[PDB]
């Protein structure tokens, strides 16, 4: 059996969602991570930081019901 | 294409019971008296079958 074994763990600061002009942004797949400078979105099994855009996330509700939500910005390409 | 394949499987078999007294000593009183001290073996067989 040929299998894939992940290794070389690293700690990041994480959040469930980000608030941006009164809306809650949840990731499509992946997690929001903070590495000391800015917030990125990444896959769970490999570390590959990506810019939080409108394509990565989706909107559901306003930011006063989710526990642990933070303020940040979402880059719209247009 | 859309295909349909059949697969057959057994689920149960026949439930059976035996009566030691008639199999070993059929309608004989002397044989039943001699068999009277083998009763643990027959209750063991009946428990297995049930």
């Amino acid at each position: 059996h040929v299998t894939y074994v992940p290794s070389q763990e690293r700690n990041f600061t994480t959040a469930p969602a980000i608030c941006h002009e009164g809306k809650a942004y949840f990731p499509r797949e992946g997690v929001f991570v903070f590495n000391g400078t800015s917030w990125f979105i990444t896959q769970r099994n490999f570390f590959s930081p990506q810019i939080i855009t409108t394509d990565n996330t989706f909107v559901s509700g306003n930011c006063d019901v989710v526990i642990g939500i933070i303020n940040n910005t979402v880059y719209d390409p247009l | 294409s859309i295909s349909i394949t059949t697969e057959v499987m057994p689920v149960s078999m026949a439930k059976t019971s035996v009566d030691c007294n008639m199999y070993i000593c059929g309608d004989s009183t002397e044989c039943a008296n001699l068999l009277l001290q083998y009763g643990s073996f027959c209750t063991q067989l009946n428990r297995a079958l049930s």
Partner: protein, 99 residues
């Protein structure tokens, strides 16, 4: 029995702290709400459903645990196929003695 209890305690602690990753390899820490969000996402429900109804889901979890606790304090036959093993072993040895 203490060794088996220690094994089950280790399994429950690893599930509550690391999640699903300690079976594939080294354990990865993750807060429990995010693990619940991934489990919700795995069955086809978006994670905002978890993150907006967290109080209700937590209360239902606690209520279900209490019902499991109350069911096992009343005399019943829930563990009746574990009793059959010890009954069969004892009956076989006593049959050998009586034969």
């Amino acid at each position: 029995d203490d060794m088996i209890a220690a094994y089950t305690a280790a399994l429950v602690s690893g599930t509550a702290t690391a999640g699903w990753t300690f079976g594939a390899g080294a354990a990865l820490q993750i807060p429990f709400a995010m693990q619940m969000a991934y489990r919700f996402n795995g069955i086809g429900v978006t994670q905002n459903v978890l993150y907006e109804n967290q109080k209700q889901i937590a209360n239902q979890f606690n209520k279900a645990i209490s019902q499991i606790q109350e069911s096992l304090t009343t005399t019943s036959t829930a563990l009746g196929k574990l009793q059959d093993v010890v009954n069969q072993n004892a009956q076989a040895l006593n049959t050998l003695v009586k034969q």
